Amino acid sequence: HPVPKKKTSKSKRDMRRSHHALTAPNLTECPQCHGKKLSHHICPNCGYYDGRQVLA
Amino acid sequence: FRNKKQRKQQVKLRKPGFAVAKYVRMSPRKVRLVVDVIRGKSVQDAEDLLRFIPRSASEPVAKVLNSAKANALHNDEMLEDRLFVKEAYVDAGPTLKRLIPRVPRARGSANIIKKRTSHITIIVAEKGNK
Amino acid sequence: PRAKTGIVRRRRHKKVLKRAKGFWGSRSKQYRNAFQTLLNAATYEYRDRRNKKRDFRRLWIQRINAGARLHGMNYSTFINGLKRANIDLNRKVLADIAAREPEAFKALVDASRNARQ
Amino acid sequence: HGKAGRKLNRNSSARVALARAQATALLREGRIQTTLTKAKELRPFVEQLITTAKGGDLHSRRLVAQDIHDKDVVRKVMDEVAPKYAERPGGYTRILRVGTRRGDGVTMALIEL
RNA sequence: AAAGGUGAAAAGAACCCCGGGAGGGGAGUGAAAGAGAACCUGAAACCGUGGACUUACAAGCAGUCAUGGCACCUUAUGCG
RNA sequence: GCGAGAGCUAACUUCCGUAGCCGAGAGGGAAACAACCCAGACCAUCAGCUAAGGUCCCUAAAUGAUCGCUCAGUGGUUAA
RNA sequence: GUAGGGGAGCGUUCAGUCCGCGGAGAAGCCAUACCGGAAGGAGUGGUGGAGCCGACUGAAGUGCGGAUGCCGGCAUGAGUAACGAUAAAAGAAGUGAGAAUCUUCUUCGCCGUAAGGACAAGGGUUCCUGGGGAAGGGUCGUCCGCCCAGGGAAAGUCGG
Numbered sequence A: 001h002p003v004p005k006k007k008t009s010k011s012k013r014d015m016r017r018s019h020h021a022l023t024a025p026n027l028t029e030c031p032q033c034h035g036k037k038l039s040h041h042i043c044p045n046c047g048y049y050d051g052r053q054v055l056a
Numbered sequence B: 001f002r003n004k005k006q007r008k009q010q011v012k013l014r015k016p017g018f019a020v021a022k023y024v025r026m027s028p029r030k031v032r033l034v035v036d037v038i039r040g041k042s043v044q045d046a047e048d049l050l051r052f053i054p055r056s057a058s059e060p061v062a063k064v065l066n067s068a069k070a071n072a073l074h075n076d077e078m079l080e081d082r083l084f085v086k087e088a089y090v091d092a093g094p095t096l097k098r099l100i101p102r103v104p105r106a107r108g109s110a111n112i113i114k115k116r117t118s119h120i121t122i123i124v125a126e127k128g129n130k
Numbered sequence C: 001p002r003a004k005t006g007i008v009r010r011r012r013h014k015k016v017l018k019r020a021k022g023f024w025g026s027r028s029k030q031y032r033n034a035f036q037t038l039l040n041a042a043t044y045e046y047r048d049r050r051n052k053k054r055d056f057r058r059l060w061i062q063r064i065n066a067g068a069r070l071h072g073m074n075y076s077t078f079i080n081g082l083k084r085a086n087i088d089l090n091r092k093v094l095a096d097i098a099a100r101e102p103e104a105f106k107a108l109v110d111a112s113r114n115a116r117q
Numbered sequence D: 001h002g003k004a005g006r007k008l009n010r011n012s013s014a015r016v017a018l019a020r021a022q023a024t025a026l027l028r029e030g031r032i033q034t035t036l037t038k039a040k041e042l043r044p045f046v047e048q049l050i051t052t053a054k055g056g057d058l059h060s061r062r063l064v065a066q067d068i069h070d071k072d073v074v075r076k077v078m079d080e081v082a083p084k085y086a087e088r089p090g091g092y093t094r095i096l097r098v099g100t101r102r103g104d105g106v107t108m109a110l111i112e113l
Numbered sequence E: 001a002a003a004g005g006u007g008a009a010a011a012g013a014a015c016c017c018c019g020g021g022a023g024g025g026g027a028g029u030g031a032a033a034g035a036g037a038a039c040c041u042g043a044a045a046c047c048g049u050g051g052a053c054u055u056a057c058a059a060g061c062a063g064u065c066a067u068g069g070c071a072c073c074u075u076a077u078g079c080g
Numbered sequence F: 001g002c003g004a005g006a007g008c009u010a011a012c013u014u015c016c017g018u019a020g021c022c023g024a025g026a027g028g029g030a031a032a033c034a035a036c037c038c039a040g041a042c043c044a045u046c047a048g049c050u051a052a053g054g055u056c057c058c059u060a061a062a063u064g065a066u067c068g069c070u071c072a073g074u075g076g077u078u079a080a
Numbered sequence G: 001g002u003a004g005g006g007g008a009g010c011g012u013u014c015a016g017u018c019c020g021c022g023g024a025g026a027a028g029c030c031a032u033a034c035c036g037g038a039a040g041g042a043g044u045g046g047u048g049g050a051g052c053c054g055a056c057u058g059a060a061g062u063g064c065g066g067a068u069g070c071c072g073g074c075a076u077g078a079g080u081a082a083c084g085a086u087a088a089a090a091g092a093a094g095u096g097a098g099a100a101u102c103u104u105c106u107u108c109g110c111c112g113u114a115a116g117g118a119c120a121a122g123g124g125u126u127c128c129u130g131g132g133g134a135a136g137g138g139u140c141g142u143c144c145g146c147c148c149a150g151g152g153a154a155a156g157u158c159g160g
C-alpha cells in the first residue's frame, strides 16, 4: 500500500536536506614529515607517530 | 569597440583559474557534498581536506582542483601563495543509457539509470585581500 | 499545406508566464498553474478594485470621528451638525484636516456646535 | 537494556575460529593490520594467551595448543615469545590506528606485539 | 522502432601544461574555436553557483488591494 | 411562501397548482451559508445619498434621548 | 449571463502581386517599465549566422490545460528500500596510477548420490595465449563468461 500523496516541493525537500551537510576533517600538521595528518593516528607521509611506525 | 565580429576577432576569450571534469560517472548530488567544504579556502587546505575526505567523489574533485591550480600557475602566471578557490560547482551529465531495457510497460518495471551527471568544475583566483 | 503550431503557443505562454512574478513556487514557473492562478487573480483584481473605495471610506471616517471625539462630538454628531449647516458640503477626505491641521478641525467642530445649540 | 562483556560481529562459532586465527597470525608475524574493532577484540584474547604460555609447563603448552593450531606458532610463543616477556607485568600488545580504507570506507589499524 | 547539420574549405587542433584515463587550460589554424568532432541554432521542464531584498509566536488555493521599509534608474526619476 | 393530494398535517420527502429567486446572478445583509431579506455589476475615481441591515470591542456607524419591563444570562432550545 | 443565434476582428502556414530589408548581418531565441478596446503589435538592447518583414488578395492539416489523451524529456518518492539464500572468513606476500575484492602462500569454514565427474539436447568461440578497463559486473576491479587481436578443433574402427 502506503504511497505519498503529492510530489514534495523543491522548497520543503531541500528543507529536509538541511542536515546532510558534510563535516570536513579537522586536521593538523605532522611534527615530523611536515604534512597534514589526522588526530590520534599516524602521519601517512613519514610514518611517524611519537618516533616512527609504518614504512611509507 | 567597432561592431559584433570585430570585437569577436580582436579578442580571444580567456578563462583564468578554470578547469572542468566532464562526464565523470557519478551522481552530482553526492559530489556537491564533497565540494561544498573545499569552496572558499586556500588551495593548500583544499588539497589537504580532499586528501583526507572519506567520500569516493573526493577523488576526482582533487584531481580537478590541481589542474585548475595547474592552469592558474602556468597559463595565467599566477601566485600559488595567493591562490584560493574563487568558485566551484557541479551539475549536469548526459545521464547514461544503453537502452538495453526495451520496455513493454511491464515485467522489469522501472530500475537502474546510472547518472553521468558529474561535470565537476573548479575555479581558482588570487586572494590579494590580505 | 499545414501550419505547425510553432512559436505561437510558446509566445502566448511566455506572456502568461511573464505576468507571474513574485508568485510562490510552482505558480511563478510552470505555465498551467500560473495561468489558473491568474483566473482567481482576475477575480480579486476587479473586485478589490471596486472595493478599496469602501476601504478608504472606512479609514477616513475612522479618523474623522476620532478627532471629533477628541473635541467632544462624534461622526454621527459631527456630520449632523456640519451638514445641518448648509455651510459645509465639505465632505470628502476631511480626515486629513483632522489629522494634519488640528486648529481647523477645531473650528469645524465649534461650527458644528453652533449649528446644534 | 543490552549489557554484557562480549562483542560479536558474525555468529558464535565464527568469532572463535576467527579470534583463533588472528591470534595465530599476530604471534606469527609480530604485527598485523586489520580493521580497528577486530583488533580491539584481538587484543585481550591474545594477551591472556601470552599468559597461559608463560609459566612454561606441559599443561600450559597444551592449553595453548587448543587455540593455536600451528605447532610452529605454539613453539614460538612458548619457547621464544612467552619467556621473553618476564618482568613484563603483563600486556604487551599495543594498538595503532593507521587510517581509513578505500573500498568499504572502514578505518583500519595495526596491532603489534 | 527512433535516428540529420563542424567549417566556405580539413586548415580537423604540431607543441606545452594537470591527469593512468576521461576531461579540460594554453598555443596555433579559422572571419568566427561566442564552429572542436557529446561540433547550426539551443526554448521549456529540471539541477546548480553567485548576488539583491528577506524569513526561526504563525494557521497558511499561494493570490488581490492598501500603506511603510529597503535596493535599483537602457521603453526608466515616475501615475517607476 | 401560498393552495391540495399521497405521508405520520414526519423528511434537505414525493406529486400537481402558484408567485419569486437559484439555475445562467456577481454586490450588501443573514458569523459561515444556491434558494431567504435588500438590490440586477458597461468602463475609470483616495467624491456624495441611501436599501436590507446595523451604530459597546474585535468592524464602519448614538455606550442615543423619554416612558416601562425583565434579575432569568431569560436573552442565546420544545410541550402537556 | 449557461447551452444557442447574430456582428465585428487578432494571430499562424502556404500562394499571387506590391513595397522593400539583410554579412556595417536575416529568421529564430533572450530580456524589457512602451502602443492598442481585446486577440495582439512595435521600440531598443543581448544571442544567432542565411534569410526575412510590411501591404492587398486568395487557400488552409490555422490557434490546446484538460480527453486515466500521444512521442519525448525531466522531476517527487531519496541518497530511501534494496545489492538475489545466515556454506563465516583470516593474516602475510605480490602487482598497480589506484586493491576488502586480481595473483601467490599459509590457515579457516562448505558440498561430497554433490554443490565431484562424464555425456545428451540446446548455446555458438563463450576454450587457450597476449593484451584491454568505456559500457556490461547489483560495490570495487589491475579482474571476468565483457572489449581487441592471434591461435586452437585432426578418425577405415567412436555417433551419424
Ligand SMILES: [Mg+2]
Binding pocket: D001, D002, D003
Ligand atoms: Mg545495562
Ligand SMILES: [Mg+2]
Binding pocket: D002, D003, D004
Ligand atoms: Mg553493552
Ligand SMILES: [Mg+2]
Binding pocket: D013
Ligand atoms: Mg556449529
Ligand SMILES: [Mg+2]
Binding pocket: E077, E078, E080
Ligand atoms: Mg521613478
Ligand SMILES: [Mg+2]
Binding pocket: F013
Ligand atoms: Mg424534496
Ligand SMILES: [Mg+2]
Binding pocket: none
Ligand atoms: Mg445562518
Ligand SMILES: [Mg+2]
Binding pocket: none
Ligand atoms: Mg549508504
Ligand SMILES: [Mg+2]
Binding pocket: G080
Ligand atoms: Mg521514507
Ligand SMILES: [Mg+2]
Binding pocket: none
Ligand atoms: Mg529508515
Ligand SMILES: [Mg+2]
Binding pocket: none
Ligand atoms: Mg550476492
Ligand SMILES: [Mg+2]
Binding pocket: G088, G089, G109
Ligand atoms: Mg565462510
Ligand SMILES: [Mg+2]
Binding pocket: none
Ligand atoms: Mg562437511
Ligand SMILES: [Mg+2]
Binding pocket: none
Ligand atoms: Mg562497476
